[PDB]
């Protein structure tokens, strides 16, 4: 996997080039915005259980056929697996927030996941809905103005939203 810094390095090596000043400048701003990134990870991680449970509750309220007998989330084994998947997707999204790059998410979570759910008969569009609900809770928690030095985190919330939408697109 790559972080934001290693990605610039790998692109540079392919051309056999030292970094430019534009690239150094871009990477410096990445470092100057680092405190915000650490808060976002800390906050989303610190509320991981409620994000999952509350999103799952909402999903089953809107799609009751999932929990009816014969549904894909009926039985405790299937429910456990469903909640587990939500936890995993969230986990890998937080990894990508820390690294500032989606490679870890794409490579270790999303590659082949659509195919996985198709073989099982798990409705991918239902999974997408679960991810979208976790997204909306995560951004509300991460971007909460209470209990933190005030400032603008909007470009980071855009980036965070980017990682969630990528995962929802990957399964749907």
């Amino acid at each position: 996997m790559l972080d934001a810094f290693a990605k610039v390095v790998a692109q540079a090596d392919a051309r056999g080039e030292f970094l430019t000043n534009a690239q150094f400048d871009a990477l410096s701003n990445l470092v100057k915005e680092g405190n915000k990134r650490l808060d976002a990870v800390n906050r989303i991680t610190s509320n991981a259980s409620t994000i999952v449970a509350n999103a799952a509750r909402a999903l089953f309220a809107e799609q009751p056929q999932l929990i009816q007998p014969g549904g894909n989330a009926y039985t405790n084994r299937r429910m456990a697996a469903c909640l587990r998947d939500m936890e995993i997707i969230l986990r890998y999204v937080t990894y990508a927030i820390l690294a500032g790059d989606s490679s870890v998410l794409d490579d270790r979570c999303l590659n082949g996941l659509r195919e996985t759910y198709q073989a099982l008969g798990t409705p991918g569009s239902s999974v997408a809905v679960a991810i979208q609900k976790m997204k909306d809770a995560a951004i509300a928690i991460a971007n909460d103005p209470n209990g933190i030095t005030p400032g603008d985190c909007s470009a980071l919330m855009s980036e965070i939203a980017g990682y969630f939408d990528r995962a929802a697109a990957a399964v749907a």
Binding site: L2, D3, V9, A10, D13, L19, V31, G34, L38
Partner: protein, 162 residues
Amino acid sequence: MKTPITEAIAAADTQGRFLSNTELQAVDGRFKRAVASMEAARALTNNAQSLIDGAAQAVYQKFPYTTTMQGSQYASTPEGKAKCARDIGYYLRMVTYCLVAGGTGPMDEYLIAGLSEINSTFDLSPSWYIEALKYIKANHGLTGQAAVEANAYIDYAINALS
């Protein structure tokens, strides 16, 4: 690629865990050090050409037989001298990449893996590249923690060649 950030993630991922405060402190450590590292990387990049030219000559001075002896492994032809300068620039470029990424990763992947097989096969002496690296170290002109940073990765290459 090995950086303080991918290491923090690998640790968590290996144990199936979310990131903890254990790992966030590690990444903050990297963000704070980045100022010294970027200073080093910038200076080495801006002064790259003189450092490469100076370093190659340091090598020819120490091992004069490299400019006289017949064979494609030596710098006794224009082609050989150009290959030597190229390689020395590769070393320097890898150091700047390490500085930027905050770890050995770039050098580990692009230079050190396979190194001893390459040097053995083409009859390239490690001590040539050590001398080149010692010149860069003595003459980069950095001070304080920028020097500590650049020297850490230069010395890393030296131990890989030793």
